[PDB]
């Protein structure tokens, strides 16, 4: 058991609607999206920007001309003082959780009292890259306009597409194509029900788009049927389980979670929505990277002195239906408490943004349900997992 | 109060850095991942640190410059034999990144989430791609689509619309630093690099790399035949009558470093040989328009936390992003020039964005020990308006 050195409280948690690839948010940079979530979080928590001592943003694939400045530009844009530092981190799909981890660490070593911890991705803006042309070409060479997004979805250390790591898990854990499609349908249904009941209202940071207000996830396909899913072809493997219907969507979006020490909550009269009770990051076999949430969630629980049975809500990012199902079977997760309002298959997976959304959703949904504990997690390309546990306040 | 010690003792048990390659030079075919791997392997070997003891891998890298870049820290960890269970994080605090990975490592150690951390920094600027934007979803007849130079556009801070060099010209104006004073500093960096290199002062830190076969173990960008008269003839690159030229700005370069840090408990458990102890560090924001001043609040804050003063520093390093930028820092803190950037810096050997902080730390670790000194502080300005500083103590 290892408790955080200091109490750390979530005092605001907001996330943008998620846009489809080439959809309604395609002309916003990852920096813009992060800005929108951060502004909404500051406003929802009534957190003065002046109070923020550190800015940390998760972002995976640099996708704008100003990308290397992301965290700093977000901080300055939302009125946080110029003296406040700003860090951009990349733990791939875990990035939106990892910014919160880094924030907790800075608070716990007394280097910060209030941290803006976001995650963002614009996958629509991922550039094509022309490599190896600065210093001359050779007649007859095959120069590519390389799709930075598509090539980033293969782990070159094991030469596997992400989807093929998920197929590896389907084989290993005896998960059928049909089971994957049924899970995919359930994510669409659960997203639809949640959306229509208002369960995304508190977390949602609406964005004005070219003028209309976007406040609904664009990728979701609430008219999906099992029959439709059954007809889709496997995309990556003959007779494979992974289709365009049961993989997470490519998407654009961001979130922002503001965390504060107990001292800061008292000093500034913040309203805590949750407490961060623990977290854990683990490496795992890159060839089955999708299993990361298993050691991540187990380790986090162990450090917190809790068990799975104590979790009222579990979130496992829906990178691929078979990937999620392998995690579910390995931990014996209770499906009535896991991804209760849908996930990335329905609303997409903006790489750096998903951890922030999942955390924001857990914070508000845990409170709505009157529950005590929740844990959010994601697998990470390259072979890692991350998990963050919250407790209601 | 202002004083603050690290929660746990954190020791440097290895510190290595690659030779730095020129833009389009000897290391141009190595990815930032490859370069980091070479530094990390060398550090593991020099510290006799078994890869199995490493609990976390943290790498600074600024501009993604290879098709595998988003995986960089993880690939480095796996390539050097660190267990698959060990996590891996890539961070970007721009030019401060190579210091920042060490800061993150210190934090993880101090909250007992790690005992031994591989903290590196790397950049391949030679590999920065051209980017084609806005063509996924159709084009419009008559639009002006660019093969955008990702490196060049990244050297302008779009929040204030200033090239990095122009923020340095802002400092030259503000602090009354002349073109001639800048060129004299630049000459001194070349001279100091040359003397250090020839005396063997980079030997302990150096992680040689086999290139196309020869062993590269000397910084490629350095121009030891530089004279003041040569520098005087160069034109200002960014501003009419400006101070900044190609001769007194840091070079574009490729290179990496690796610093392995360990808790006191790990040093004792594994019988590591500490080279230094991390005493303190600090990161501050500052005005983006004069981002080059970042080392001033960063160094001041770190010293304040550590209960030390500038007079206690046997060595000071301020990354030489631009001569006028460095000189504005020197004048603001009244640095002792006989103890500051003593063996040259980025004007001579170049500035691989993510790699410089790792090299500076590594150099301080070995040079402090060589001098028999007690304390050193390394620092860098950070595009966007930040600064970072790390203070070490000899063991
Ligand atoms: C699988 C993948 C390649 C598909 O991308 P895509 O082809 O642009 O996806 P689309 O939305 O265009 O769907 C393609 C087809 O499936 C159909 N389809 C998808 N979902 C459907 C649904 N729920 N119901 C009915 N049809 C559906 C689409 O309508 C389309 O058919 P059509 O062109 O005949 O109309 C992409 O989503 C992917 O790789 N996602 C995972 C990203 C990832 O790896 N992230 C990191 C995780 S670690
Ligand atoms: C200044 C800068 C644009 C110059 O790029 P560059 O012109 O390709 O650099 P070079 O090495 O080719 O030097 C250009 C010219 O100056 C000359 N030069 C440079 N240093 C010289 C020296 N020490 N003595 C004599 N000539 C020198 C070169 O010989 C060359 O002349 P040439 O055209 O006759 O061959 C580039 O180095 C830069 O932008 N550096 C800073 C990058 C940065 O901002 N990093 C982040 C810091 S915050």
Tab-separated table of N, CA and C in Angstrom, chain A residues 278-373:
chain	number	residue	atom	x	y	z
A	278	UNK	N	-4.926	6.824	-6.431
A	278	UNK	CA	-3.787	6.090	-6.834
A	278	UNK	C	-3.710	5.985	-8.339
A	279	UNK	N	-2.598	5.471	-8.798
A	279	UNK	CA	-2.404	5.275	-10.224
A	279	UNK	C	-1.229	4.336	-10.365
A	280	UNK	N	-1.051	3.826	-11.578
A	280	UNK	CA	0.050	2.916	-11.879
A	280	UNK	C	0.279	2.811	-13.364
A	281	UNK	N	1.536	2.730	-13.738
A	281	UNK	CA	1.909	2.549	-15.139
A	281	UNK	C	2.754	1.310	-15.200
A	282	UNK	N	2.438	0.395	-16.108
A	282	UNK	CA	3.231	-0.801	-16.280
A	282	UNK	C	3.560	-1.031	-17.752
A	283	UNK	N	4.684	-1.685	-17.989
A	283	UNK	CA	5.028	-2.133	-19.319
A	283	UNK	C	4.432	-3.515	-19.488
A	284	UNK	N	4.273	-3.949	-20.718
A	284	UNK	CA	3.833	-5.314	-20.999
A	284	UNK	C	4.394	-5.687	-22.372
A	285	UNK	N	4.167	-6.926	-22.790
A	285	UNK	CA	4.595	-7.395	-24.130
A	285	UNK	C	4.013	-6.509	-25.228
A	286	UNK	N	4.883	-5.916	-26.048
A	286	UNK	CA	4.392	-5.047	-27.140
A	286	UNK	C	3.452	-5.740	-28.127
A	287	UNK	N	3.658	-7.034	-28.329
A	287	UNK	CA	2.824	-7.788	-29.284
A	287	UNK	C	1.391	-7.996	-28.860
A	288	UNK	N	1.136	-7.845	-27.565
A	288	UNK	CA	-0.197	-7.855	-27.024
A	288	UNK	C	-0.382	-6.599	-26.134
A	289	UNK	N	0.014	-5.445	-26.659
A	289	UNK	CA	-0.024	-4.206	-25.908
A	289	UNK	C	-1.381	-3.917	-25.274
A	290	UNK	N	-2.442	-4.394	-25.916
A	290	UNK	CA	-3.801	-4.162	-25.478
A	290	UNK	C	-4.127	-4.679	-24.090
A	291	UNK	N	-3.274	-5.541	-23.570
A	291	UNK	CA	-3.437	-6.082	-22.232
A	291	UNK	C	-2.912	-5.170	-21.133
A	292	UNK	N	-2.264	-4.071	-21.504
A	292	UNK	CA	-1.703	-3.148	-20.507
A	292	UNK	C	-2.574	-2.840	-19.318
A	293	UNK	N	-3.883	-2.642	-19.523
A	293	UNK	CA	-4.713	-2.315	-18.381
A	293	UNK	C	-4.739	-3.352	-17.263
A	294	UNK	N	-4.409	-4.604	-17.569
A	294	UNK	CA	-4.408	-5.630	-16.534
A	294	UNK	C	-3.358	-5.390	-15.456
A	295	UNK	N	-2.054	-5.375	-15.796
A	295	UNK	CA	-1.119	-5.041	-14.723
A	295	UNK	C	-1.284	-3.598	-14.212
A	296	UNK	N	-1.762	-2.680	-15.065
A	296	UNK	CA	-1.892	-1.287	-14.618
A	296	UNK	C	-2.961	-1.165	-13.536
A	297	UNK	N	-4.145	-1.692	-13.810
A	297	UNK	CA	-5.244	-1.655	-12.845
A	297	UNK	C	-4.872	-2.469	-11.580
A	298	UNK	N	-4.269	-3.641	-11.756
A	298	UNK	CA	-3.863	-4.468	-10.576
A	298	UNK	C	-2.869	-3.777	-9.673
A	299	UNK	N	-1.867	-3.156	-10.272
A	299	UNK	CA	-0.885	-2.410	-9.519
A	299	UNK	C	-1.444	-1.193	-8.803
A	300	UNK	N	-2.283	-0.441	-9.489
A	300	UNK	CA	-2.905	0.717	-8.895
A	300	UNK	C	-3.747	0.320	-7.703
A	301	UNK	N	-4.553	-0.706	-7.883
A	301	UNK	CA	-5.382	-1.184	-6.775
A	301	UNK	C	-4.522	-1.620	-5.580
A	302	UNK	N	-3.456	-2.353	-5.846
A	302	UNK	CA	-2.590	-2.825	-4.803
A	302	UNK	C	-2.012	-1.640	-4.034
A	303	UNK	N	-1.521	-0.614	-4.743
A	303	UNK	CA	-0.969	0.538	-4.070
A	303	UNK	C	-2.019	1.290	-3.248
A	304	UNK	N	-3.241	1.342	-3.751
A	304	UNK	CA	-4.312	1.998	-3.031
A	304	UNK	C	-4.871	1.177	-1.858
A	305	UNK	N	-4.486	-0.084	-1.736
A	305	UNK	CA	-5.088	-0.995	-0.740
A	305	UNK	C	-6.554	-1.311	-1.028
A	306	UNK	N	-6.912	-1.403	-2.315
A	306	UNK	CA	-8.260	-1.706	-2.712
A	306	UNK	C	-8.302	-2.925	-3.593
A	307	UNK	N	-9.488	-3.445	-3.827
A	307	UNK	CA	-9.630	-4.560	-4.742
A	307	UNK	C	-10.592	-4.160	-5.826
A	308	UNK	N	-10.698	-4.983	-6.876
A	308	UNK	CA	-11.603	-4.691	-7.959
A	308	UNK	C	-13.008	-4.559	-7.486
A	309	UNK	N	-13.369	-5.365	-6.490
A	309	UNK	CA	-14.750	-5.381	-5.986
A	309	UNK	C	-15.109	-4.021	-5.389
A	310	UNK	N	-14.110	-3.252	-4.970
A	310	UNK	CA	-14.367	-1.898	-4.452
A	310	UNK	C	-14.691	-0.867	-5.521
A	311	UNK	N	-14.419	-1.175	-6.786
A	311	UNK	CA	-14.670	-0.226	-7.875
A	311	UNK	C	-16.144	-0.235	-8.232
A	312	UNK	N	-16.784	0.924	-8.168
A	312	UNK	CA	-18.136	1.094	-8.653
A	312	UNK	C	-18.203	1.265	-10.164
A	313	UNK	N	-17.155	1.846	-10.736
A	313	UNK	CA	-17.033	2.003	-12.176
A	313	UNK	C	-15.621	1.653	-12.588
A	314	UNK	N	-15.527	0.975	-13.738
A	314	UNK	CA	-14.293	0.677	-14.370
A	314	UNK	C	-14.397	1.212	-15.784
A	315	UNK	N	-13.332	1.826	-16.257
A	315	UNK	CA	-13.201	2.186	-17.670
A	315	UNK	C	-11.926	1.594	-18.226
A	316	UNK	N	-12.076	0.914	-19.371
A	316	UNK	CA	-10.993	0.369	-20.131
A	316	UNK	C	-11.190	0.922	-21.519
A	317	UNK	N	-10.241	1.746	-21.947
A	317	UNK	CA	-10.382	2.393	-23.246
A	317	UNK	C	-10.611	1.329	-24.328
A	318	UNK	N	-11.593	1.578	-25.173
A	318	UNK	CA	-12.032	0.607	-26.216
A	318	UNK	C	-11.211	0.731	-27.475
A	319	UNK	N	-9.913	0.447	-27.374
A	319	UNK	CA	-9.057	0.580	-28.532
A	319	UNK	C	-9.501	-0.338	-29.671
A	320	UNK	N	-9.805	-1.577	-29.312
A	320	UNK	CA	-10.423	-2.569	-30.247
A	320	UNK	C	-11.316	-3.485	-29.427
A	321	UNK	N	-12.463	-3.861	-29.965
A	321	UNK	CA	-13.357	-4.764	-29.188
A	321	UNK	C	-12.587	-5.992	-28.596
A	322	UNK	N	-11.788	-6.693	-29.417
A	322	UNK	CA	-11.128	-7.872	-28.866
A	322	UNK	C	-10.118	-7.532	-27.784
A	323	UNK	N	-9.480	-6.371	-27.916
A	323	UNK	CA	-8.550	-5.923	-26.931
A	323	UNK	C	-9.246	-5.691	-25.591
A	324	UNK	N	-10.343	-4.923	-25.618
A	324	UNK	CA	-11.134	-4.682	-24.431
A	324	UNK	C	-11.599	-6.027	-23.830
A	325	UNK	N	-12.119	-6.905	-24.675
A	325	UNK	CA	-12.638	-8.192	-24.152
A	325	UNK	C	-11.568	-9.038	-23.487
A	326	UNK	N	-10.338	-9.006	-23.998
A	326	UNK	CA	-9.228	-9.734	-23.340
A	326	UNK	C	-8.980	-9.184	-21.956
A	327	UNK	N	-9.041	-7.855	-21.835
A	327	UNK	CA	-8.882	-7.261	-20.511
A	327	UNK	C	-10.021	-7.676	-19.587
A	328	UNK	N	-11.235	-7.549	-20.088
A	328	UNK	CA	-12.428	-7.928	-19.329
A	328	UNK	C	-12.313	-9.384	-18.760
A	329	UNK	N	-11.937	-10.315	-19.614
A	329	UNK	CA	-11.763	-11.737	-19.204
A	329	UNK	C	-10.589	-11.916	-18.293
A	330	UNK	N	-9.478	-11.191	-18.509
A	330	UNK	CA	-8.333	-11.371	-17.615
A	330	UNK	C	-8.585	-10.916	-16.198
A	331	UNK	N	-9.328	-9.842	-16.043
A	331	UNK	CA	-9.618	-9.292	-14.713
A	331	UNK	C	-10.979	-9.696	-14.174
A	332	UNK	N	-11.735	-10.408	-14.992
A	332	UNK	CA	-13.066	-10.798	-14.687
A	332	UNK	C	-13.922	-9.581	-14.352
A	333	UNK	N	-13.907	-8.577	-15.227
A	333	UNK	CA	-14.587	-7.337	-14.930
A	333	UNK	C	-16.096	-7.537	-14.974
A	334	UNK	N	-16.799	-6.784	-14.165
A	334	UNK	CA	-18.248	-6.815	-14.177
A	334	UNK	C	-18.730	-5.855	-15.269
A	335	UNK	N	-19.362	-6.413	-16.282
A	335	UNK	CA	-19.784	-5.649	-17.435
A	335	UNK	C	-20.841	-4.623	-17.103
A	336	UNK	N	-21.590	-4.821	-16.016
A	336	UNK	CA	-22.566	-3.819	-15.642
A	336	UNK	C	-21.905	-2.564	-15.051
A	337	UNK	N	-20.622	-2.651	-14.723
A	337	UNK	CA	-19.867	-1.525	-14.128
A	337	UNK	C	-18.714	-1.009	-14.994
A	338	UNK	N	-18.560	-1.587	-16.193
A	338	UNK	CA	-17.433	-1.326	-17.043
A	338	UNK	C	-17.882	-0.673	-18.344
A	339	UNK	N	-17.233	0.434	-18.686
A	339	UNK	CA	-17.570	1.236	-19.863
A	339	UNK	C	-19.074	1.436	-19.980
A	340	UNK	N	-19.663	1.880	-18.878
A	340	UNK	CA	-21.124	1.885	-18.728
A	340	UNK	C	-21.833	2.783	-19.717
A	341	UNK	N	-21.137	3.824	-20.205
A	341	UNK	CA	-21.753	4.769	-21.125
A	341	UNK	C	-21.055	4.767	-22.466
A	342	UNK	N	-20.596	3.599	-22.872
A	342	UNK	CA	-19.969	3.507	-24.182
A	342	UNK	C	-18.515	3.889	-24.077
A	343	UNK	N	-17.868	3.934	-25.229
A	343	UNK	CA	-16.477	4.317	-25.288
A	343	UNK	C	-16.023	4.509	-26.694
A	344	UNK	N	-14.721	4.325	-26.888
A	344	UNK	CA	-14.024	4.724	-28.109
A	344	UNK	C	-14.553	4.106	-29.411
A	345	UNK	N	-15.152	2.934	-29.366
A	345	UNK	CA	-15.786	2.369	-30.544
A	345	UNK	C	-16.917	3.273	-31.027
A	346	UNK	N	-17.703	3.820	-30.102
A	346	UNK	CA	-18.785	4.764	-30.418
A	346	UNK	C	-18.284	6.174	-30.648
A	347	UNK	N	-17.553	6.732	-29.677
A	347	UNK	CA	-17.200	8.172	-29.787
A	347	UNK	C	-15.785	8.484	-30.274
A	348	UNK	N	-15.013	7.454	-30.599
A	348	UNK	CA	-13.670	7.624	-31.128
A	348	UNK	C	-12.571	7.671	-30.078
A	349	UNK	N	-11.328	7.603	-30.571
A	349	UNK	CA	-10.148	7.571	-29.766
A	349	UNK	C	-9.095	8.598	-30.241
A	350	UNK	N	-9.303	9.882	-29.922
A	350	UNK	CA	-8.238	10.869	-30.140
A	350	UNK	C	-7.092	10.535	-29.175
A	351	UNK	N	-5.999	10.021	-29.694
A	351	UNK	CA	-4.986	9.363	-28.897
A	351	UNK	C	-4.698	10.023	-27.541
A	352	UNK	N	-4.261	11.280	-27.551
A	352	UNK	CA	-3.937	11.955	-26.306
A	352	UNK	C	-5.118	12.390	-25.483
A	353	UNK	N	-6.294	12.510	-26.120
A	353	UNK	CA	-7.496	13.016	-25.472
A	353	UNK	C	-8.288	11.984	-24.683
A	354	UNK	N	-8.218	10.692	-25.059
A	354	UNK	CA	-9.107	9.734	-24.473
A	354	UNK	C	-8.965	9.574	-22.962
A	355	UNK	N	-7.731	9.587	-22.443
A	355	UNK	CA	-7.506	9.472	-20.997
A	355	UNK	C	-8.140	10.618	-20.243
A	356	UNK	N	-8.136	11.805	-20.846
A	356	UNK	CA	-8.720	12.968	-20.180
A	356	UNK	C	-10.237	12.840	-20.171
A	357	UNK	N	-10.826	12.454	-21.286
A	357	UNK	CA	-12.258	12.243	-21.342
A	357	UNK	C	-12.671	11.170	-20.330
A	358	UNK	N	-11.974	10.028	-20.342
A	358	UNK	CA	-12.345	8.918	-19.444
A	358	UNK	C	-12.315	9.337	-17.978
A	359	UNK	N	-11.286	10.070	-17.603
A	359	UNK	CA	-11.194	10.576	-16.249
A	359	UNK	C	-12.349	11.546	-15.963
A	360	UNK	N	-12.608	12.474	-16.871
A	360	UNK	CA	-13.680	13.448	-16.699
A	360	UNK	C	-15.042	12.767	-16.603
A	361	UNK	N	-15.263	11.764	-17.441
A	361	UNK	CA	-16.477	11.029	-17.381
A	361	UNK	C	-16.633	10.294	-16.053
A	362	UNK	N	-15.592	9.611	-15.610
A	362	UNK	CA	-15.632	8.935	-14.335
A	362	UNK	C	-15.956	9.888	-13.167
A	363	UNK	N	-15.304	11.040	-13.141
A	363	UNK	CA	-15.531	12.003	-12.093
A	363	UNK	C	-17.039	12.355	-11.995
A	364	UNK	N	-17.664	12.709	-13.108
A	364	UNK	CA	-19.055	13.125	-13.117
A	364	UNK	C	-20.030	11.937	-12.986
A	365	UNK	N	-19.726	10.797	-13.616
A	365	UNK	CA	-20.607	9.639	-13.550
A	365	UNK	C	-20.580	8.972	-12.173
A	366	UNK	N	-19.413	8.885	-11.539
A	366	UNK	CA	-19.312	8.370	-10.212
A	366	UNK	C	-20.211	9.191	-9.269
A	367	UNK	N	-20.129	10.513	-9.388
A	367	UNK	CA	-20.944	11.396	-8.573
A	367	UNK	C	-22.436	11.220	-8.896
A	368	UNK	N	-22.801	11.185	-10.179
A	368	UNK	CA	-24.174	10.953	-10.560
A	368	UNK	C	-24.706	9.653	-9.927
A	369	UNK	N	-23.905	8.589	-9.922
A	369	UNK	CA	-24.364	7.291	-9.410
A	369	UNK	C	-24.338	7.203	-7.883
A	370	UNK	N	-23.718	8.172	-7.214
A	370	UNK	CA	-23.485	8.135	-5.795
A	370	UNK	C	-22.506	7.053	-5.379
A	371	UNK	N	-21.580	6.694	-6.277
A	371	UNK	CA	-20.605	5.670	-5.979
A	371	UNK	C	-19.414	6.218	-5.209
A	372	UNK	N	-18.513	5.310	-4.822
A	372	UNK	CA	-17.365	5.665	-4.014
A	372	UNK	C	-16.042	5.672	-4.801
A	373	UNK	N	-15.785	4.639	-5.582
A	373	UNK	CA	-14.498	4.518	-6.270
A	373	UNK	C	-14.696	4.256	-7.729
